[PDB]
Structure formats: structure tokens, C-alpha cells
Amino acid sequence: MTVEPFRNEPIETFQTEEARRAMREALRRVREEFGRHYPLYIGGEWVDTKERMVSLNPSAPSEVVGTTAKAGKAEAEAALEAAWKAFKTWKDWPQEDRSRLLLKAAALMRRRKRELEATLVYEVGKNWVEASADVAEAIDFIEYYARAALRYRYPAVEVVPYPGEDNESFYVPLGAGVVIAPWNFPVAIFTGMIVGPVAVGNTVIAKPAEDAVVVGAKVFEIFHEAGFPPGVVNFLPGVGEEVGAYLVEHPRIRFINFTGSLEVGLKIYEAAGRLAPGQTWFKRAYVETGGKDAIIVDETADFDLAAEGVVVSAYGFQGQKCSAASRLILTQGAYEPVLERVLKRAERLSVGPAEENPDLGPVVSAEQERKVLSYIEIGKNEGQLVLGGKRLEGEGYFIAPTVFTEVPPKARIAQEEIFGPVLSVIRVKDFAEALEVANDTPYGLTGGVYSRKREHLEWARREFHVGNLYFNRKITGALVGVQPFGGFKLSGTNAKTGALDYLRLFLEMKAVAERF
Amino acid sequence: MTVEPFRNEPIETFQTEEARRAMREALRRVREEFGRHYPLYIGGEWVDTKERMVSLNPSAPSEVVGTTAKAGKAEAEAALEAAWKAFKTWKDWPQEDRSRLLLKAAALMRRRKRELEATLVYEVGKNWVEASADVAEAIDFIEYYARAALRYRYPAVEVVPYPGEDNESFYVPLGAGVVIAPWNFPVAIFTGMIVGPVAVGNTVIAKPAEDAVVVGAKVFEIFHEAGFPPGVVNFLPGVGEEVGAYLVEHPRIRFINFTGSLEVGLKIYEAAGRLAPGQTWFKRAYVETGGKDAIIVDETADFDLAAEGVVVSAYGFQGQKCSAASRLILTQGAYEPVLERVLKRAERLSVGPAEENPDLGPVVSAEQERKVLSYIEIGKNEGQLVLGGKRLEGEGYFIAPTVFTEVPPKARIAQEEIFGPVLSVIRVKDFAEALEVANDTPYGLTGGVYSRKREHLEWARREFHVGNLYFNRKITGALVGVQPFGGFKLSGTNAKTGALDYLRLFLEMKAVAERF
Amino acid sequence: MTVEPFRNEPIETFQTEEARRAMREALRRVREEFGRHYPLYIGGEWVDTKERMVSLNPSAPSEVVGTTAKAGKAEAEAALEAAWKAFKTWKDWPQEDRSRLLLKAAALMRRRKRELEATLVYEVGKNWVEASADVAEAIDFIEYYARAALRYRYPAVEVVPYPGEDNESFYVPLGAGVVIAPWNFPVAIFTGMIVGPVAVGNTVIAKPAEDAVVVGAKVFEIFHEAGFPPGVVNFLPGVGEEVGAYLVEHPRIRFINFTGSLEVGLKIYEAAGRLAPGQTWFKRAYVETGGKDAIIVDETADFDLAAEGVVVSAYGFQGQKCSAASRLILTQGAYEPVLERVLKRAERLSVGPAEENPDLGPVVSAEQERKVLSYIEIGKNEGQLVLGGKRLEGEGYFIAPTVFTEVPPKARIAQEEIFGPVLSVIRVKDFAEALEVANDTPYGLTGGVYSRKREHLEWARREFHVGNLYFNRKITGALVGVQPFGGFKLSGTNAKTGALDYLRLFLEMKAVAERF
Ligand SMILES: NC(=O)c1ccc[n+]([C@@H]2O[C@H](COP(=O)([O-])OP(=O)(O)OC[C@H]3O[C@@H](n4cnc5c(N)ncnc54)[C@H](O)[C@@H]3O)[C@@H](O)[C@H]2O)c1
Ligand SMILES: NC(=O)c1ccc[n+]([C@@H]2O[C@H](COP(=O)([O-])OP(=O)(O)OC[C@H]3O[C@@H](n4cnc5c(N)ncnc54)[C@H](O)[C@@H]3O)[C@@H](O)[C@H]2O)c1
Ligand SMILES: NC(=O)c1ccc[n+]([C@@H]2O[C@H](COP(=O)([O-])OP(=O)(O)OC[C@H]3O[C@@H](n4cnc5c(N)ncnc54)[C@H](O)[C@@H]3O)[C@@H](O)[C@H]2O)c1
Ligand code: NA
Ligand code: NA
Numbered sequence A, B, C: 001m002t003v004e005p006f007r008n009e010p011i012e013t014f015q016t017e018e019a020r021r022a023m024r025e026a027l028r029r030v031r032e033e034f035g036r037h038y039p040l041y042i043g044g045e046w047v048d049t050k051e052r053m054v055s056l057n058p059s060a061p062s063e064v065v066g067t068t069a070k071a072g073k074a075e076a077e078a079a080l081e082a083a084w085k086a087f088k089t090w091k092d093w094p095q096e097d098r099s100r101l102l103l104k105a106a107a108l109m110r111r112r113k114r115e116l117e118a119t120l121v122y123e124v125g126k127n128w129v130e131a132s133a134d135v136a137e138a139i140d141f142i143e144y145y146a147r148a149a150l151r152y153r154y155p156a157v158e159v160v161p162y163p164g165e166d167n168e169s170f171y172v173p174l175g176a177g178v179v180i181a182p183w184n185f186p187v188a189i190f191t192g193m194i195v196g197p198v199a200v201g202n203t204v205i206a207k208p209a210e211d212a213v214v215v216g217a218k219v220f221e222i223f224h225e226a227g228f229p230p231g232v233v234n235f236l237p238g239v240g241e242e243v244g245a246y247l248v249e250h251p252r253i254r255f256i257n258f259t260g261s262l263e264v265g266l267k268i269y270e271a272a273g274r275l276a277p278g279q280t281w282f283k284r285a286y287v288e289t290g291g292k293d294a295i296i297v298d299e300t301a302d303f304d305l306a307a308e309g310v311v312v313s314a315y316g317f318q319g320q321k322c323s324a325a326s327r328l329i330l331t332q333g334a335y336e337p338v339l340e341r342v343l344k345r346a347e348r349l350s351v352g353p354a355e356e357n358p359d360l361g362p363v364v365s366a367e368q369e370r371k372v373l374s375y376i377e378i379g380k381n382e383g384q385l386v387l388g389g390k391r392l393e394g395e396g397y398f399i400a401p402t403v404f405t406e407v408p409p410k411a412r413i414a415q416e417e418i419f420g421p422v423l424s425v426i427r428v429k430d431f432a433e434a435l436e437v438a439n440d441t442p443y444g445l446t447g448g449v450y451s452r453k454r455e456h457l458e459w460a461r462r463e464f465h466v467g468n469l470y471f472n473r474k475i476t477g478a479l480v481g482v483q484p485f486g487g488f489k490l491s492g493t494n495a496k497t498g499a500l501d502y503l504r505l506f507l508e509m510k511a512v513a514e515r516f
């Protein structure tokens, strides 16, 4: 297989009339399609159920974007049988053939990108550029993993020779596993977590987040059109604590690929460590969990550059990112100039229905709204509220960009992942204290430093203990291939997505010697 | 760092007068030192305790080979503080400096090889060649990991560039972890499990098996002379279910590197999945557990070659190997010719005090003797005893090479790891059935096939589901670098020792972007 | 597949008592088996015929060394059906599996080397070292081509990428072909010409020389034990102009691999250019034919070194080599010193029964004896006989080392391949004239220069137009891998044996594009 060198899919900014025209038409068609029903996908066919999952428009939750079928234990069992049956032959496909299947799926996704973006806008309340970034990242995962998988092809292992013998070590896929995905990047992360394992010969049962079942179905439309053999990928929208837990705990699930909250990841990792009755392997579980990500700014920084990057990092997709800047750590000399600039920029942010392409759409659900507002109440008794802190008028789940300042490093709002548009500002003496405060959380996902001082940047390179660190730029939007993505500590197991290493997680090695 | 390409340390065969003289001299020096007491080693110093561990000569268990200190919770805490303190600076050593330290340790070990072999002979009842193989493998782990670690050096990760930015991804070590080691390869595996993590910047608390505390201490003498900084490696002989479990469950233990029984491995993996109170990471646990390994012989094989390889594989070190052939699966045409030859060879094997270089020494302990004899009793109810099956005369734990025939594939003796000199012979119809029987255990560590038929060998390459497979040769004695070692299924987590991939298990990745 | 880097099989010199003992034992075993009959080998089985081929001991031609079956048209058809049937599946074996099969065959051959050497001694009258070189070269071809074939494995071709497409180019084998082999290296060349095409997925019908049918059969015993699938290699001893020509001209023969006389090579190449009735391809024919090889010596040479190298090159295996020095071209200053030394050395050469390890055995047959004696008669009319030129006493075909001087460059004995122990000495003015005389034959296989003058050596490198050129050493005994072997002009098609390029001759390329 010879293809062009990997390049990232450009993210559409909708500055041209052509782009606007295409997006308007895509939004119109998706809107006109509200109420559509999407079945499960098991063993190469769409399979309906009596019960259903309902997906609302968070900008106008009286509106049903669509419904899907709902997978319970029986459907989980059918999916397991289909996946294991498929594994038997899928594992034996030449890698070139599997990689070509991924490239076909990428081409099909690229041709439907405006539709998928529009679906994100309505289903999870992304503005237009956030939706475009999500779909572009999904395409990137497919393109990248298709190529990366070839690096593991038979027989890939470097071994020491021995006289009179052939010694051959090679990788093989694990089997059938479950992918359990979040609602905040329900095209990108859903796609990446499925196609990585599948590329190298595993089969997958995919459980999309409840709030993002429709766009998950559309991804499966693409898989089906691409022509993955029956059973290779299966789509099981359903309740996480029910069908998700059922699969995690199952003796016949070989691996678990999970991205989501720490609370859930902890349960999954613990369950994975247990030998279910009749289980005949040690389960592999990859859990990529939340963060409490900080940007440090010192007195040497470009304060205007810093303020812009902080606002993008804190409020992009309403702060609903594992990578979002939820802490702003300012040295004494940076405090007033940066805070004033951040407040001025943040107070100008628009909030409204995602279809209008505002700066911020709504948060994803009534439950998310309730949690963010609850943390705002907690914050009022911990730090000083200096911007926002209110639900805005409207049926949609609109929350104003919020800033607390003089926040104690150990305050709940400085330690716990809020996952909404709520920034906590922490005042410290100097760069050394900034790093101490940055590191003193249970998490270790993303971080940033704005500084012109070389020694501070290189110090942070060595000691700001996060998996994805950025200097003099935003801390969100890690690009596949460019920035291997994944954290330390309670931000998860450090499975680095969009990196060569990711696929190794879904392989085991055999060593075969023949003495002639 | 530029050193010669890796080569395996030659295994001494003692065919020369000089080698035999050197061994006798070593045996004498070692037995003259039977009175010795070896403290713990914590934070760069030998530290004694009130209580002690006693080590016996399994060939003459009324003879004490040495005593050691005994680590409890306080000593585990002292070792943790030392290991975390050391980690802070050890992680920052240039890789070249750490690799040189390993190379020094290897040179020191090589200079002490006869002493270590003699210690194995007396402490765990290895004959001369088994002892030499064990020490040589230890040297190999050090030489191999020293070189392999340089492949991960700053900044090792291949990433896609982005305009106007430096993107730099690199590996960092995890922290302080615990190594919990078996008695059966108490120089080789003890050494490998310690020096792999340490090479790339981790620090280690090492817990040797109770039955092999003296030789473990001698390995630490080598580490100390080599000059590992205080706290980098720590020696904590003690009781597995006490100090071992304490460290496994500890919130401040970052990883666990375990080799031992499935029973214990299951507990360790389960415990590792739990978040201990105050723990701030997802623990990594590598558990490399037992096997129920088969050799298949078909009617096209060289039956004499097969019989020799089977006897070596089944009875080397009294069958006390995770890799030992405990099942012999014979197609109908191979059955009588191979069984007759195996019996003729096995009946000629000598059993006695290990220092006399018999074919078999004793099993390692009264507990092991009890276990093996109990399985012989079970086997008498399940199959037909045709050779051995008896304790032999003397205080030493001498057990005769044992063969059961007419063993049902689902019999306890055909499924459960006996870990003694007991071979179960299973008759099957053809090669397909041989593979079915081979695969139908909870394990997947080693296997072999004797056959001249190319299609049978290549079929086994694809479908005999074991981590280490060998054709027309013994299934034991995997060489570092040549045969990455580790299994599938309940044989553990497939951490492939003596392979480039091993060191990756003890690293995490950071990605750092600077926008200029 | 990972094996040790290629090394040449050492050529036994028999300087030790053990080697001499082993040879005597082999000679005894072989002569005890002189009564044996060897069938054809077709479709994985030995198949006999009514008629037979008889093989004689050229050192005692009243002594039969063995008999074989005799292939005619019906047997050629049976072999074709078997080879095409096998090709259908053999082409689809992974390259690693085919290469392992070769490696097995090499191991089996190495274990039988003394037996094969002894068979060469008795069947074709090689002395001990000539026999050992021949078998060692055979082993080398198998070891080298096994490794070289992996360099062509799917998908091996370097292509330029194109947007939105996968472009994949890869090699496939041609089909079933015929190998037609000479008697002078009937283990080495017979083996190389078969296993090269077979390695990369072709199937072969092998036609050994009439004078070397027994040793060819022994090579097939090795192939059979190695377990090549039925039809992959087939053994058809028979008459060249009958069954050989039949296969060459056949519409269903895909390629011809020939080594032999120019006379026969010309007929084969011509026939291969024709479209037989119903043929559906352009046949590939590789024809590696004779030489009229010269050594040039100038007045700057080490004359003793030159004389030794000339005598080795001219008289090794009785001059019955395509590489043998049959011309000695001496500049005026070199003439007397070199000729005197060549004569002194040549007159001391022993001639007798090959089993006694004389310097020269007999020529291979009554026909060869007739040819060589006839050329001696021609030479007496063209040049001056100064040594030998006589049949020696005994039934065996013993001919004395022969030297003609004052030979005109255009003389028949200076132009035509004699293929016996006959050296023609030509006096020239200077090095320029030496090169002119060297180049002025229809051939271009091997050549040599003895000279200390750098400018003369480098001039010859550029202008002595032979495929295999050697400076200050013998011109025979090209080693696999070290010296790609094959000539220019009427020495054949320049198929370079023991070189990476050789296998390409037996492959065609497919290019497959998928637009996504
Ligand atoms: N580290 C990363 O790369 C990354 C990326 C995106 C989001 N996240 C994290 O995800 C969280 C937001 O996503 P979310 O609200 O969907 O998370 P969530 O944990 O509530 O749910 C994630 C998925 O797990 C399922 N689930 C819920 N309970 C389960 C159970 N007990 N067993 C099995 N599955 C169960 C859900 O149905 C959903 O499919 C945030 O904490 C965010 O930081 C992390
Ligand atoms: N897969 C491999 O590479 C491999 C290699 C060698 C041995 N083994 C296996 O090891 C076993 C024999 O070794 P063993 O008898 O020393 O095994 P074991 O499981 O009894 O003990 C191994 C180590 O764990 C410690 N231990 C015991 N209980 C513990 C607990 N609950 N928590 C923490 N540590 C505990 C012991 O003290 C010892 O140091 C066999 O099953 C054999 O197959 C496997
Ligand atoms: N270039 C080289 O690598 C090389 C190597 C060895 C020998 N040779 C040459 O081989 C010759 C000696 O070998 P030989 O006497 O066996 O050669 P040859 O040409 O007489 O016979 C070679 C093979 O071709 C067969 N044959 C004869 N006539 C045929 C026909 N018309 N159609 C098809 N096959 C036919 C023979 O039976 C034999 O198997 C010398 O000329 C020597 O230089 C060349
Ligand atoms: Na929704
Ligand atoms: Na002991």
C-alpha cells in the first residue's frame, strides 16, 4: 500500500461564501431530518428494538434531533457472538487490505463532513468551527491509524538471530472488545477508539454516549457503506451503567477502550482487574479520563496573546473538553494585566443556539446544566465571582462565561472537574509557585505556559507534569499525529491517541522458533 | 554510548577440566559461607532486622544455606521513601549514564558467575547446566536492556510536524514500583524484572521469593558494588502475602512487576485495578504467570529427536519451569514410537543431590514436594501411571521422573500446573485434534511441535495459541533477545521479556508544543 | 523470518584426521550403494519407468555407480500437470514459509555433505576438494536465495504516491518452468537453478545432465525429506535432445533456466523466442553458456603467485569449468619467467582415480575424452605442444595436463571451448595488446590479471570485458553472494547467480490502484 504522506484534514473556518453556503445547506437538511430513527448495527445489519434512546437539541430541548434503538443484555450477547465470529477471519486479513478499508471509510466521511458537522451542531451544541474540528479529527484518526497499522505488519519484531534457527516474532490482535465513548467529541473520539483497534485486526462493540447517539449512528452508516465485514464493528447505543457495565464485566470481553469521566473510569479499571467467572485472560482496559488543566502566565508573557489563548482554551465548546483551561495561574506581575484582558475578552463572548454559530452554544443536557450551576454556587463560597455565574434566558441550556478570582489552590472549584464555562483564577508569587500549584491536583492532562523566558519554558518542559503541554498557544485541539494525546495521574492510562504507540495497545506478540 | 552488538552469554557445559575445577572451587567457597546472614538493602545501605528468613538446601534440608533479614511494613515504608527520593534525581540521569551503570553490573555479575551458579545449586537445587543457564540469562537481561533503553532516549517519538511550532514527544519513567519474583529463576528473572524498569529511570523495591533469598542478596551485592545511587534498587526479602501484598496494595506504589503463580497473579492484578485511599494514578501491573505447556508430535517427525526434546523440556530443573512440557500430545501414528522412546530416555535419568550434577535435583521445598505428590495421587485416579510417581530415598526432596498415559484432555493433571517432574501423555486422532487439545487449557505460554510436514508447522505457527512456540526443538530456555518471552491467556499480561517492547511498559509519554 | 546474516559454507580441505576418516566412510557408504536404482520424482512421489539411464564411474567406466528412470514425453506431461497444479497454491504461500522450506533443505544438505561429495567423486570424477566446493556452493545457493527472496516480498515496489488513491505494486512468480543442468557442477548449479525460481513461488521440472543423474537424484531425496509440496519440484533424468527439447519447445512451459554448452544454449534461446501452437506468453529463457577464459600476466607481477593461480585455474577439475583458464596471455617481459614456472608446476600434477584425491581425476566420459583428444590433435597443427597431450594408462579417462605455446590468437584452440586440461599460451607485446587478445573471442565469462601495476589493474577493471574478473588470484570458484556469477557475449544472458538480481528474473510485476 502506497499513499500520500499523512496530512491533517484542514479545519473549516467558514470565512468564504462557498463554505457558508455549504454549511447552511447541511444545517437545513439535518434540521429537516429531525425525528429520524436509527437502529442498532449488529453483524452487518441494522437491528431495531422496542425500547428507544431519545436525543434532544440542547439549544432547544423540546426538539428531538432523533431516536435510536436501545441495546440491553440480549443485544450485547448478539453483538458478542457477531464480533467473535468476525474476529476469526478479520484477524487473518492482510494488513494492507484492512488499511485500505479504513482509507475508504475516511474518503466516505470526508464526503459527508458538512452533514456530520451540522449533526454535531444540533445534537451536542457545538458552534460551526468546533463541529468542523471534531469531524476533521475523526478523519485524521482514520487516515493516521490506517498508515500506522502498516508499521506493525507481519513479522514486525526486531530479534537477535541464533545459529541453525529461524526466530520470528510478530504481532496479533487480541479479539473482540468494547469501546465506550463520551458525548463531547462524539465523532472524533468515537471514531478513533473504534478504528484503531479494528485496523490491526480486532473487532469492536461500540457504545456511544447517550447524548450523542444520532451522530454515532451516522458514523456507522459510513462504516456500513465502506463495507466492514459483518461483526467487525457493532453499534450499541444504550445506558452506560446498564449495557456498558454489562460488557465491561463480561468474561468474553477481551479489552475495554474507554474515554469519559474519572468516576466511571475508576469503576471500569477496577472491574477490568477482576476475573469474571469463566474468563480466560487478563483484560486490558484503557481509560482516558478528565483533567483540571491550567495555563500559567508570568510577567514576561505577551499578555494580549495570553488572554486570547486563555479565552479560547477556557470557553471553546463551553469548557466541555478534557483539555479545557479551567485554571488560570498568574504570577504577581502578570495578575492585573492578564486578568483585566481576560475579563474584557470574555465579557464580549456571544451565547446562543449553536446553529447561529455563537461563541458559546448551550451545555449538553439538563443534568450537565445542573452540575455546572451547582459548582458555580460552591465557587461563590470559595472564590470571588467577577464575571457571569448565571444561567441565561431561554429553553436551551445556556450558561454565561464565568470567572472566579483569588481562588485558593485547594478549593473545590480549583480541584474538581466542572466541565462547563467556569474559569478559576489563582494568584501566585512567582514561576516556582505557579508550577507547584499547577502540579497539585489529582490530574495531569493538558497545561500551558505563556512566557518569553526560555528558562521558564524549559523548566516547565521538565516539570509541569501533564501529558500534553503547550507554550505560547492554546491548550486545546491536539492534532492527530502532531501531538500524541493523553495524560498522567488520574487523567488516565496514558494511551496516546494519534500516535504510533496507540495501536500496540491492541496487539499481543508471538515468538516462533524453528530449529532446522 | 557505543558497545559491541548484543550477544548471548554462553552457557557453560563443563566439558573441560578447567570448568569443572572452577565449579568445584565455587561450590566449596559457597558452602564455606553457609553461615552467612544477609541484611535488607535500603537507600544504599545494608539494614538488618530483628526477625529473619532461613534458607535451606533442598538436597539436604537439615542444612541451612544462609539467613536474611525480614522486611515488614516499617521496612517497606523505609524502602518507599528511599525509592521515591532517589527517583527525583535518577529519572534525570542521561540514558547513557544509566545504561553504563547496567553494563558495569553485568561485568561484575560475569566475574562472579561460578559463585552465583554454585549458590543456585545449593539454594534451589539446580544442576550445573541449569544453574549456568540461569546466571547467563541474568547477564543477558542486563546487557540487552542497557542497549534497548537507548532506543527510547530523549526525544524518541516520531511525530508529524506543524507550521510555526516545535512539537516534541518523549518518554519519561513512571516512578517507584515493586518487583515480586519467583524462586525458580531467582537470578535471571529477579535481575531482569529489576534492571528493565531501572534502566529507563524507574526505581525499584525488590521482593525475592522466600526460597531464594540468599542468591537474591548476592545479586544485590553486585548492584551495590556497581554503585547504583541510594534508593534506586532496594532488597526486601520477606513473606509474599505480608510485605508483598502490602506494597501491591499501597497507594504510593506506581507499578508492579510480578512473575509467579496464577493464583497470586490474579490477586495482584485485581488489587492493582483498585484506587487505594489517596492514590493519584492508575497502577500498572505486569503479571507473568504459569503454563500447561504441550509438545505435539505427529507421525512425520524424527521420533528420536522428539523424544530427546520432550525429556529435556519435561524434566529440566525437575519440571519447575513455567515453560516446561507438562503435556505430550501424540497423533495416533506417533503414539507408540514416541512414547516408547520417551520412556526409555526418562527411565535412564539420574536423580540426586544437585551438586553432583544429576539429570534431576530435588524439588525446591517440602511444600513443593507435598504439592507434586498430591498431583501424582490425583493422576493415579485420572490416567495410567507408567513411570516414576514416587518420592526417592533421602532427606532431600527427590521425586522420580513421572509419566501418566491415557490422560483425558480435561483431567486435572492435563489442565492444572503441577510444577514438578510429571508428564501427561494424551493420544489424539490427527494434527487438527492435536491443536484443539493443545489450545484447550486456560493457559498459553509455551508449546512445541515435532513434525517434518511444512503445512503442519505453518498451521501451528498460525493457530497453536502460545506466546513462545518452538518447532523441532525443546520448548524451554528462551534466550534473551532471540525469543521475546511471555504468554497469552492466563499465562499473564504478555510482557515480553528480553525484547525492545519490554521497556515501553515502564515509560509514559509527554508531548510538548511551542508556538514561536 | 530472522536468521543469522549469510555466510559461505566453508570448503573442507581434509587437513584433519577426522575429515579424512569421514570422507573414507562416505566413500565406502556410497560405493556399497552402487547397485541402487533411482526413479523419477513427480508430484511428490518416486515414479519408475520401463527404460533406464546408466551412470558410470569415469575413473573406472566398467563400474556402474547407479541407474535412474528415464523420462520421455509422457513423463514430461505428467510433470507439467503436477507443476502447474502445484503452482496454483505454492504461489500463495507467504514468502517466509517458502524461505523456511529452503532453509530446511539447506540444513538437510549440510548434514549429508560427505555423502554428496563422495557421490561427486565417483560419478563425475571430482577430487576431494573440488567435490567439497561443489556441495558447499549448493548449500550457499539455498541459504542465499532463501534470504534474498524476502527482499521481494509483498508489496516490494517503490512507487510515487497519488492523491486520493492507494497505488500498490508487487511481484508475482511466473509459473512452471524447466531447469536443464550440466554435469560439471551437478550439485551446485543443479540446486541453484531449481531453488532460486522455487523460492519466489515458481514450480520446476528439473532435467539433470545424463552424466550426473545419480547425484541429481540424491539432491531430490533432500527436497523430498524437506517436504516441498507435491509438484513444486520434479526430477526428470533423461536425454537432453529428447525430453529436454520437448519441454523447451512446449507451449505450457513458462520459463527455461539453462546452463550448458553454447551449441545447446543457442538452440534453446532460439526455440524460446517462438510462439508454440496455443502458447499464451512470451517465454523467458536464461542461458548461461561457456567461456574461453584468459589470465593476463605482465612483467610487474609476482610470477610465482601467477604460476600457482594459473595452474589452479587451468587444471582444477581437469579444466572442465566454464570459468577455467584456457588461455594464458603473457607480455614479453613476463613470458619466459611465467611459462617456466607454469611448466614446472604443471609437470608435478598427479592424475588418477578421483577417490585417491589426485590433482586431476579423469575427464567425465568417453565422449569428453574423444573431444579433448581431438582438440589436442588440432592444437598440434596450430601451436607447439610443450607438456602432456596424451591419454594416460587405465580404463579411466585420464588425460595429462597439457600446454601449447606459440598459439596464434585466432587459432581454433585459442577460440573454441575445449573443456579439458589444455592451456594455450599466447605471447603479446604489452598490456594493451594483452587486453585486445583477451577480448577477441566470442565469449566473456571469466578473466584474470596478475600485475602489481595499479593502472593496468584499473584499466582491466574498465576494459577486460568479462562478467567475472579477478586480480592476483585464481579465476575459478566464484563464491555465492561475494561474486555474482555470469558472463557477457556468447557466455550467455548475464543471469547473475548468487546475487539479489537473480530472483527478479523469475518474477513479474503487477500494479494495482484503488481510487477511494
Ligand atoms: N482523556 C480524554 O481524552 C477525554 C476526552 C473526552 C472526554 N473526557 C472526559 O469525559 C467526561 C465527559 O464525558 P461523559 O460525560 O460522556 O463521561 P461519562 O463517564 O459520564 O460517560 C462516558 C461513557 O461511559 C458510559 N458509562 C457511564 N457509566 C458507565 C458505567 N458504569 N460502565 C460503563 N460505561 C458507563 C456512558 O454511557 C458514556 O458512553 C469528562 O470527564 C471529560 O474530561 C476525557
Ligand atoms: N510466566 C513466567 O515468565 C514465569 C516464570 C517463572 C515462574 N513462573 C511461575 O511462577 C510459579 C512458581 O513460582 P513461585 O512458587 O515463587 O510463585 P508464587 O506465586 O507462590 O510466588 C511468587 C512471588 O510472589 C510472592 N507472593 C506470594 N503471595 C503473594 C501475595 N498474595 N501478594 C504479593 N506477593 C505474593 C512470593 O513471596 C514470591 O516472591 C509457577 O506458577 C510458574 O509457572 C512464571
Ligand atoms: N555459464 C555457466 O555458469 C556454466 C557453468 C557450468 C557449465 N557451463 C557449460 O556447460 C558445458 C558443459 O556442460 P554439458 O556438457 O552438460 O553441456 P550440454 O550443453 O551438452 O548439456 C547441458 C544440459 O542440456 C541438456 N541438453 C543437451 N541437448 C539439449 C537440447 N538440444 N535441448 C535441451 N536440452 C539439451 C543435456 O542433457 C544437459 O542436461 C560447457 O560448455 C560449460 O562451459 C557453463
Ligand atoms: Na443530544
Ligand atoms: Na532454599
Ligand code: NA
Residues within 6 Å of the ligand: C055, C056, C057, C058, C122, C123, C124, C211, C212, C364
Ligand atoms: Na558418470
